[PDB]
Amino acid sequence: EIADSINLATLFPKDLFREKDNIQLRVFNYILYGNGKPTRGISDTSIQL
Amino acid sequence: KERDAVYESLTYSSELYVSAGLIWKTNRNMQEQRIFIGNIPLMNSLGTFIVNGIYRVVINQIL
């Protein structure tokens, strides 16, 4: 299960007030491999999924 | 040298090198090498080129 809660309070101090901004950050979840596609493991290297 | 390109009927030219990356998503390996695109003829200070030993000049066109 991919957590829809990625810990990024590590980014900003979460101010008491936040003004409306044209900019807006986004968290995008990314499944690195296609559906049914093989994930090949090279020796001594871990596979990120 | 320029006198060599004339004696041997060669072309006075320079080698264009670029780095190229080739990603194979089958193995996710990105391989980068210095690729040799080809030769670019060089111009002498007198504005002349040496192609196959022949002195050549590119004239100006008005359009």
Q: Which of A14-49 are b and which e, b meaning 16 or more Cβ less than 10 Å from the residue's Cβ?
A: eeeeeeeeeeeeeeeeeeeeeeeeeeeeeeeeeeee
Identify the residue whose tokens are 């998503």: B25
DSSP character at residue A47? P
The Cα–Cα gap between B57 and A12 comes to 64
Method: cryo-EM
B20 with B32: CB under 8 angstroms? Answer: yes
Q: Which token pair is A18?
A: 């936040």
DSSP state letters, B6-51: HHTT---EEEEEEEEEEEETTTTEEEEEEEEEEEEEPBPTTS-EEE
A32 with A48: CB under 8 angstroms? Answer: yes
* H or E element, residue A28: none
Nearest to B50 by CA among B12, B14, B15: B12
Please state whether beta strands B13-24 and B29-41 pair in parallel, antiparallel, or not at all (unpaired).
Answer: antiparallel
Q: Which token pair is A42?
A: 């090279």
Phi and psi, residue B3, nearest 5° = -65, -30
Q: Is B5 helix (H, G, I), strand (E, B) or coil?
A: helix
The Cα–Cα gap between B6 and B38 comes to 20
User: Using alpha carbons only, how large is chain A's radius of gyration in Å?
Assistant: 17
The Cα–Cα gap between B50 and B35 comes to 25
